[PDB]
Amino acid sequence: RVLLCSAGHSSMVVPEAFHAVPEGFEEVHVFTTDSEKFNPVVLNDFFHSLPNVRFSITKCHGLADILNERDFEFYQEMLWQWYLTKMPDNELPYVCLSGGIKSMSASLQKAATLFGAQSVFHVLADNNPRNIEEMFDALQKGQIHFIEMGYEPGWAALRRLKKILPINEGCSRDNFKPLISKSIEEILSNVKIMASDTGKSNQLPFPSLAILPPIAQQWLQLPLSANDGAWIQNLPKVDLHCHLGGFATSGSLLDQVRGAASEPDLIDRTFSPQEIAGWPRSHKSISLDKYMELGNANGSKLLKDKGCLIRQVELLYQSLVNDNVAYAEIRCSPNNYADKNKNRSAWVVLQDINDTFTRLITEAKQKNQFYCHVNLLVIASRKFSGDLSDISKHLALAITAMQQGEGVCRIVGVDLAGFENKETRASYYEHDFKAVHRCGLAVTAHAGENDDPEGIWQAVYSLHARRLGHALNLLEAPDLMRTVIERKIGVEMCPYANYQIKGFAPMPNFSALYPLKKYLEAGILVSVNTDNIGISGANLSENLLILADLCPGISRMDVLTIIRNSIETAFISHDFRMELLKFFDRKIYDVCLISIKN
Amino acid sequence: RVLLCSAGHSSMVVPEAFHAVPEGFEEVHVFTTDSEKFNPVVLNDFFHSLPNVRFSITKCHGLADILNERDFEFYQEMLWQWYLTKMPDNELPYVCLSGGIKSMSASLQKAATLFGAQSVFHVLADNNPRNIEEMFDALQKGQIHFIEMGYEPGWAALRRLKKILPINEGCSRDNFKPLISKSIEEILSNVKIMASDTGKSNQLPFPSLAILPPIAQQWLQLPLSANDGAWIQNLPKVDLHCHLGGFATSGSLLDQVRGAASEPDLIDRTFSPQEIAGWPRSHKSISLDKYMELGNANGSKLLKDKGCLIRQVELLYQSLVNDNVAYAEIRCSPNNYADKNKNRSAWVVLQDINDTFTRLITEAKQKNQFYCHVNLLVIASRKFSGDLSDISKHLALAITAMQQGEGVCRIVGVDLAGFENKETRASYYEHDFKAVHRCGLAVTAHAGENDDPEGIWQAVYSLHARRLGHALNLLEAPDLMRTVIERKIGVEMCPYANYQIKGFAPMPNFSALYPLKKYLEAGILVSVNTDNIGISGANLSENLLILADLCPGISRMDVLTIIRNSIETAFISHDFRMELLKFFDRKIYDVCLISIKN
Numbered sequence A, B: 001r002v003l004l005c006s007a008g009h010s011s012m013v014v015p016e017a018f019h020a021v022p023e024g025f026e027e028v029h030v031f032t033t034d035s036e037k038f039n040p041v042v043l044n045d046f047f048h049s050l051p052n053v054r055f056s057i058t059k060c061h062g063l064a065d066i067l068n069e070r071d072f073e074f075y076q077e078m079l080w081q082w083y084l085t086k087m088p089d090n091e092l093p094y095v096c097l098s099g100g101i102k103s104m105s106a107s108l109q110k111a112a113t114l115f116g117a118q119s120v121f122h123v124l125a126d127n128n129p130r131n132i133e134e135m136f137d138a139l140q141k142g143q144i145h146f147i148e149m150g151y152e153p154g155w156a157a158l159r160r161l162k163k164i165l166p167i168n169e170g171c172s173r174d175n176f177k178p179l180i181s182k183s184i185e186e187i188l189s190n191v192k193i194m195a196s197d198t199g200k201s202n203q204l205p206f207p208s209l210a211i212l213p214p215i216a217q218q219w220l221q222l223p224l225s226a227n228d229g230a231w232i233q234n235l236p237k238v239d240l241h242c243h244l245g246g247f248a249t250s251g252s253l254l255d256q257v258r259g260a261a262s263e264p265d266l267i268d269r270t271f272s273p274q275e276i277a278g279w280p281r282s283h284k285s286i287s288l289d290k291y292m293e294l295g296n297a298n299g300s301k302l303l304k305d306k307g308c309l310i311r312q313v314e315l316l317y318q319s320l321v322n323d324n325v326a327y328a329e330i331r332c333s334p335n336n337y338a339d340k341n342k343n344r345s346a347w348v349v350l351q352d353i354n355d356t357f358t359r360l361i362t363e364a365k366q367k368n369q370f371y372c373h374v375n376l377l378v379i380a381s382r383k384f385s386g387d388l389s390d391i392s393k394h395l396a397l398a399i400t401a402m403q404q405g406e407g408v409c410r411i412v413g414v415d416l417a418g419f420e421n422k423e424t425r426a427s428y429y430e431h432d433f434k435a436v437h438r439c440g441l442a443v444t445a446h447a448g449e450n451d452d453p454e455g456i457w458q459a460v461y462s463l464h465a466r467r468l469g470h471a472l473n474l475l476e477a478p479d480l481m482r483t484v485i486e487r488k489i490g491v492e493m494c495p496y497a498n499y500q501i502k503g504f505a506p507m508p509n510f511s512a513l514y515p516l517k518k519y520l521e522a523g524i525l526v527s528v529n530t531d532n533i534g535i536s537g538a539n540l541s542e543n544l545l546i547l548a549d550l551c552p553g554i555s556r557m558d559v560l561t562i563i564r565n566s567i568e569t570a571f572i573s574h575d576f577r578m579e580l581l582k583f584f585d586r587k588i589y590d591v592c593l594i595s596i597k598n
């Protein structure tokens, strides 16, 4: 534990403060003015007699004493900076103020009641000793009193400034930056709002956003622009549509993933994807057959090798972490990644993926970096070319994948993905799903891509699906939005992928307007995703960035509420959801405040 | 404008403090200990030169100096009490902090931070003035210096703490009661309670709850007690399960209704209740049966006519408004009140109810009062043996009612209540609801009070229900418990009804405990309701009050979360939900900042 104090003429207050806790203090630091009256020799001797306790002195350099308003405000600002930079990262610190004249004592007490303190107290000696040999017996005689006027909690989030303002070392009065002004204006202009409006208080998610100063709060409501990309890079994000096999399809990713293949003889390195003019900003709509022929370079031909798959998983995890993503669900198809000649069953492949992800999560968590949680989603394919029984296999595997349970990464549910050419919607597979919901899994459904808005109703009701894929043409069925919104049914959508494959504004000759803003206005639980991280040629950061051009007039509150919806619609447990929400709220406050100070 | 300060050995601080604002002042008060060093002559002579203002001196009897813990606590108690009784009625005062030694400085700074002050400031003069002429010259020279720490909004609930104890007519050490120290120890006990608590600390209900002072939040963390009735009485609330047919059934509440009978003859006036002793605190648990006979004073027998029904609905709306319920839904079964001979069809009854509700709402809205928006629920009671075809009729009625659309009040869904049994589960009526879901209706299911778990599973998966009634036995089937949590299927539970039916808050010979605390901890979107108002003999406010003795260890923040859940699972459109959220956040912030003083 740590304590803070200020000393003036009374140079022996610090040893009395150290004796406050019978257990014994661990860190002692004192902030004092430039006055020569304070004697560092006695304190240095006392703290060298107890080397086990860390010791550090900071001094208000350039100000011997306070005599005008400027001296007081400079000293108070330096004191607040010192308190901010010297408080413990997690626990609140202890405070003593028995030394110093009324000015510094009051300033540090207001600091304690502003920044929070573990325990604030005073020491008073009846015999007012001067050297150690006197208060030794004074505390032995009991004349020394350790008074406590009460614990002070302080604001729940007002030490977070320790990150937004690079606690700078200090500065001559000419190089003056008023942190005092920032704290005062934030407190005032967020309290000088009364109970009138205060409407945007609830209209915003992440309830700590209200505490954010209005100097940036009104900046949040301004329409989004393509120049704010740096900011959204620092935003913690959530991805729900990221195919595992859709990562290494272009760039040096291909070279690195093929270099990790155990046998380079079988891999056909000659095949290369065809480039599209202006990619990812294509000048025309790209057909779906063109979509997975562009993605035909990746798939299952090269990931059959165990080492190649391991390297792909590690590279995808590294790309996820480097993009400030905090949570992700990865769609995988183990059946495609299995073979019997080398005796690699699909269950073995899924177990290997799970082990790789949990090992990466644990190794990232041990060293306390920013790591992204990953959960898996087994693909129950449309199963082209007959042999329908395969799908049932997948479902069974899914159940037996969930019952393993133990680990940090888990199989949260199944998927219903495939071509819309066969017109098969819900009823063509409904004969099997009377057991997945019984187990306790979750069912998504990529439907409504280019077909009628009818089968989506069966997907919502007959399948009890909790999320929907794409479905950009929901505007033609208001009776469908009624049940979509009323049921709190989430919707996943990937602006880059669907924009490339179908075409939207502002691309000329395409008059269809992108409905994401309309969906948000209607209240649909919308979640922006990446679909195929590699083939689409754009990660989640640019995928969210492009909305400033795809849907003009979109605001930053919209981006934050999409993030909130993506958090809400994830297939996660309750306690994990709250933990994720708390971490996301703290980090979102941090970034949204650091951004405006630049 | 008032000046609040403490003077010890120094008496020259007060003239400078008065001369702080060039505009002058009107009132000055000074507190002091029993120290004989303090001389009052100088201040009296100075203030007599300005008779237009009022001056006073406060002396701490029997305390000359602070030498130990008892002296410190005594001085703190009397200074806090004196500062509280000198509080101006509606305006924050100005505080001076350059008198005495640092102890009173820190104590009164803490007092100013807690109770609030217009502006706290310190004086300082180089010459250290002693008498009148020389300090007047010092003020003329401009050598006087004034430093204002900042305007403190203050915590606005310790104000009419004056109203209970303004002054204990000169309290002595033999009769001193440090009530302010009791409040401080209350907050300290809250701190040592919540210092190792997770879960709840996550996500306040609505935002703008964080802008409250930290003391307010710390108070909010305190577990709720039976003494906090007035706070929730002022608190806006929401009802979702209220029976119209059981509002007035005892006391004088049915007298004015029956009194307003259209045909004052066929109205029986001889029925009596079952002479229940402990109602609504009845320790003896009675199991159904006696309920319907107890409520026979109202219902079908009395609601056949028109005037009585209008009087009953007006009285119910008045009671709803009186309890600060900002939104509620009422269960009703119009086919039970229809009279074919008098041309009063079921549709006629429903139209009359809707029209009177919307007229009352419009009348309340015209006067800019606290109008309670009310929506309707039609009950498809499981009459079973008697002409089950009527069931379909009821559903048809609903589909034909909400279609009319226009009006503030509407029929938003159906209720599947009735004789819950092995047969009467969701397994025979599910053929008919194909229509209901196609018309944007919401379906509840009163089940689980005596039914098996698989019946609840069918209800939540076959009828696509969105809320459940009672359902007190969810802890015995963790699988359906989880499928309730992660599907966001709300649970309506009535505390008083289940208390009088089953056994919790142990009466003699019963040890079963209410699971509401476990329900909330697990993350279910639980919602406290009333079922019936009359027969239960308790409105919503007492229903929430009884929770303190029903589920000990529940905190008021969880009560706010319960309100949020209630306003989350209500069947309403998104925009109306947002507006309702705004109004609720406003009223709750105002309540917790103003009326929480008790």
Ligand SMILES: Nc1ncnc2c1ncn2[C@@H]1O[C@H](COP(=O)(O)OP(=O)(O)OP(=O)(O)O)[C@@H](O)[C@H]1O
Binding pocket: A089, A163, A326, A368, A369, A370, A371, A372, A373, A579, A580, A583
């Ligand atoms: N569910 C989570 N998801 C991602 N990261 C988490 C999660 N839980 C904890 N962490 C990590 O715990 C660490 C705690 O950090 P800490 O409280 O010390 O704040 P900080 O060091 O000032 O800034 P930062 O949050 O960036 O580390 C965070 O870095 C965070 O990445």
Ligand SMILES: [Mg+2]
Binding pocket: A241, A243, A531, A532
């Ligand atoms: Mg996809």
Ligand SMILES: [Mg+2]
Binding pocket: B243, B417, B531, B532
């Ligand atoms: Mg009922």
